[PDB]
Write an enzyme that holds these catalytic residues in place. Structure first.
Site, short mmCIF file in Angstrom:
data_model
loop_
_atom_site.label_atom_id
_atom_site.label_comp_id
_atom_site.label_asym_id
_atom_site.label_seq_id
_atom_site.Cartn_x
_atom_site.Cartn_y
_atom_site.Cartn_z
N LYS A 112 -25.54 45.31 76.15
CA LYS A 112 -25.40 46.02 77.17
C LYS A 112 -25.14 44.55 78.46
CE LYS A 112 -25.25 50.13 76.27
NZ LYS A 112 -23.73 50.61 76.48
N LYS A 194 -17.89 47.09 66.14
CA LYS A 194 -17.77 48.44 66.65
C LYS A 194 -16.61 48.42 67.24
CE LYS A 194 -21.02 50.29 68.63
NZ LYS A 194 -20.55 51.84 69.52
N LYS A 197 -16.95 53.52 73.00
CA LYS A 197 -16.41 54.90 73.54
C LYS A 197 -16.85 54.42 74.83
CE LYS A 197 -21.43 57.35 74.49
NZ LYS A 197 -21.56 57.05 76.01
N1 LIG Z 1 -18.79 53.40 66.13
C1 LIG Z 1 -19.37 54.17 65.51
N2 LIG Z 1 -19.65 54.64 64.19
C2 LIG Z 1 -20.41 55.00 64.05
N3 LIG Z 1 -21.23 55.63 64.51
C3 LIG Z 1 -21.46 55.24 66.31
C4 LIG Z 1 -20.40 54.96 66.99
N4 LIG Z 1 -21.11 54.93 67.96
C5 LIG Z 1 -21.42 55.34 68.23
N5 LIG Z 1 -22.22 55.70 67.42
C6 LIG Z 1 -23.14 57.10 66.60
O1 LIG Z 1 -22.92 58.03 67.69
C7 LIG Z 1 -23.79 58.33 68.22
C8 LIG Z 1 -23.71 58.59 70.09
O2 LIG Z 1 -23.76 57.77 70.59
P1 LIG Z 1 -24.04 57.44 72.29
O3 LIG Z 1 -23.93 55.26 72.30
O4 LIG Z 1 -23.60 58.67 72.86
O5 LIG Z 1 -25.98 57.40 72.33
C9 LIG Z 1 -26.80 56.06 71.66
O6 LIG Z 1 -26.58 55.91 71.86
C10 LIG Z 1 -28.20 56.99 71.59
N6 LIG Z 1 -28.75 56.01 72.12
C11 LIG Z 1 -28.65 58.04 72.25
C12 LIG Z 1 -29.77 58.69 72.59
C13 LIG Z 1 -30.67 59.13 73.88
N7 LIG Z 1 -32.29 59.47 73.00
C14 LIG Z 1 -31.72 60.43 71.17
C15 LIG Z 1 -32.92 60.59 70.95
C16 LIG Z 1 -32.52 60.96 69.06
C17 LIG Z 1 -31.10 60.26 68.71
C18 LIG Z 1 -30.04 60.19 69.07
C19 LIG Z 1 -30.77 59.55 71.32
C20 LIG Z 1 -25.15 57.94 67.62
O7 LIG Z 1 -25.72 58.57 67.37
C21 LIG Z 1 -24.49 56.35 67.85
O8 LIG Z 1 -24.81 56.03 66.59
#
Ligand SMILES: Nc1ncnc2c1ncn2[C@@H]1O[C@H](COP(=O)(O)OC(=O)[C@@H](N)Cc2c[nH]c3ccccc23)[C@@H](O)[C@H]1O
Ligand SMILES: CC#CC(=O)N1CC[C@@H](n2c(=O)n(-c3ccc(Oc4ccccc4)cc3)c3c(N)ncnc32)C1
Ligand SMILES: O=c1[nH]c2cc(Cl)ccc2o1
Lengths: 333, 323
Positions: A112, A194, A197
């Site tokens: 990041k 990876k 989004k």
């Molecule tokens: N290319 C990919 N392939 C497979 N899985 C993937 C890929 N990109 C993303 N992910 C998964 O998707 C979820 C959402 O990611 P976020 O960036 O929104 O969101 C995140 O990166 C978290 N920090 C959000 C969060 C904040 N507090 C929490 C407490 C518990 C669980 C999750 C959270 C995630 O599960 C991420 O692992």
């Protein structure tokens, strides 16, 4: 009472097939087996600078996408993180039981920081402590995430153990639930990077709300290999493009890699890409049909948010009250 | 009417230097300013301490501030942890605070993240109440400037959501350490250098009797900070309590030795601490009064804190809470 599932997704950018296969798909399937709590983490999202209108819209997009994926407000608690003050409250208290070293080493912070060098804020550094609070508030047993969130969870387990050791059984120690297939879906033109989004290049991603026709075009243009003859086989080090496609095929259909490899015997990448394209195009067309029915019904979204936050606050407040008692604060009346 | 914000850390025993030097000043400006006194228990947990002592010391702090004359009907007095807006604004302001700015304030892998991030909480504490003035010591001048920079940065992006806080420039009594008359008497200190507001007449005498003087022959009770630090401190302390001028006291002790001075200082101080201690123990041993002050304070604080946080949340663009 059932064991508790908790996960979150950020209302930033555009959720991808990666986000779906690594997280949401599991979220939908766990809803009867366990007590599931799903959170739109708008407080986590502002660690990268957002346009105010984009954030509001993206928060409601994320909600409607959850509902369209099959998250049931009658079975699960669905809420926006900032509607429950307990998250920020526990987060501060949990800063004081988290070491600087544990935060400095975090990969997401590093990746990041390099990308947004003009906005290396303290929230980005302290991101993991809020994420722990999020989880520990609800006495969470399971956390369904993608592989990229593994280390953040691990810190939360250490924090929960550290706190309990001093004060007793205030927290449950959470455990990761990472899928067997599609825990880390790879970018279309960069199969070693990876799927993001918020990628600068959209040609790398299969977006959940993208026009299906545009996705079939992206799949056809996906990088493969120079193998002569072309052969459909899982060889991640030598066949990253083909493999990522095979894994996408697997998780959309439920079929095994050995099964797919068998099915594409005597066939090349044209047969592969055609099959992945048909699978994913049919899924997105159905999902998007549900999405628009939900997303345009403000009164429904508003109710889900209201009931969600009420349910979460009942759990959250109970946990925070015991944390505050343990650490020695005078209890509010 | 300008809004003044002060953080009172539930730990630390207040000294006579705190009371006659600062608090006594502000007790007498409660009609001039909208004064807010926040007992900062969330700041306290940056250092590990016994939970029951923290709980006790929160109520100890509240009772003493009330006994020193802070009026809960004129000023807003409350416990930090009773107003969730502090932590809420804290997190949001983390996202507008550079990591560099937190590292720029005074191995490190073993410090808790609280000890690193608390200046952002301090910023939130201040900015929630549209504060105009923050009375700060030199140890906390860097922290106020960070609060000012954070407010301006946020304002330039979103409009005039925060007031930019200003330090309270005017300082009046010099209370120095009894065994090191060059160093100011501070709760953070050898308790033989300080006198706590709850110290008994007998303890006061023992500490004043040990207070450093000089080897002038004959002994002479005259003000001179450079050459007679100890005696000068004793005179300043006596003047602060009695309101008698230094020249008047220099005459009062003409042809007198330092024992006379010391004896009079101990009488004056213990005379002052007595009505304070009376009110303290009376307030401290009345739970329902303390609980009522806390309830009223936090309701007043939350009413104002909530309007700032709501504007911050709207600016950032979060979906508003439904409830
Ligand atoms: N290319 C990919 N392939 C497979 N899985 C993937 C890929 N990109 C993303 N992910 C998964 O998707 C979820 C959402 O990611 P976020 O960036 O929104 O969101 C995140 O990166 C978290 N920090 C959000 C969060 C904040 N507090 C929490 C407490 C518990 C669980 C999750 C959270 C995630 O599960 C991420 O692992
Ligand atoms: C750099 C440097 C320096 C320096 O010399 N020092 C000495 C005290 C060290 N230090 C604090 O100042 N605080 C702190 C405590 C309470 C507090 O409450 C308010 C809130 C709003 C307005 C006024 C006061 C603010 C800050 C610390 C903490 N929580 N935790 C640890 N240390 C804190 C900083
Ligand atoms: O996780 C966190 N860190 C935090 C820092 C402040 Cl100042 C407030 C809330 C927080 O929650």
């Amino acid at each position: 009472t059932k064991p508790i599932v908790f996960s979150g997704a950020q209302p930033s950018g555009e959720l991808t097939i990666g986000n779906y296969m690594g997280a949401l798909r599991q979220w939908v399937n766990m809803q009867d087996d366990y007590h599931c709590i799903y959170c739109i983490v708008d407080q986590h999202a502002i660690t990268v600078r957002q346009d105010a209108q984009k954030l509001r819209k993206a928060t409601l997009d994320t909600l409607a996408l959850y509902l369209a994926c099959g998250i049931d407000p009658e079975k699960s608690t669905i809420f926006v993180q900032s509607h429950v003050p307990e998250h920020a409250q526990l987060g501060w208290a949990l800063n004081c039981y988290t070491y600087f070293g544990e935060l400095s080493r975090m990969t997401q912070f590093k990746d990041k920081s390099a990308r947004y060098a003009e906005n290396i804020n303290a929230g980005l550094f302290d991101y993991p402590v809020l994420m722990a609070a999020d989880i520990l508030l609800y006495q969470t047993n399971l956390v369904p995430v993608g592989e990229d969130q593994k280390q953040h969870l691990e810190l939360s387990r250490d924090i929960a153990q550290r706190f309990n050791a001093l004060y007793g059984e205030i927290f449950k120690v959470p455990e990761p639930f990472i899928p067997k297939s599609g825990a880390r879906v790879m970018s279309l033109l960069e199969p070693t990077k990876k799927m993001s989004k918020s990628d600068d290049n959209r040609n790398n991603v299969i977006g959940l709300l993208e026009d299906p026709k545009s996705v079939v075009k992206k799949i056809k243009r996906a990088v493969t290999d120079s193998d002569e003859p072309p052969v459909v086989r899982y060889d991640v080090q030598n066949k990253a493009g083909v493999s990522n496609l095979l894994d996408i095929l697997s998780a959309v259909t439920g079929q095994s890699i050995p099964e797919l490899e068998k099915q594409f015997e005597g066939k090349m990448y044209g047969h592969l890409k055609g099959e992945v394209a048909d699978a994913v195009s049919g899924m997105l067309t159905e999902l998007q049909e549900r999405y628009h029915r939900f997303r345009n019904d403000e009164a429904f979204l508003q109710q889900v948010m209201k009931d969600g936050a009420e349910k979460a606050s009942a759990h959250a407040s109970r946990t925070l009250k015991a944390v505050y008692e343990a650490i020695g604060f005078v209890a509010k009346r």
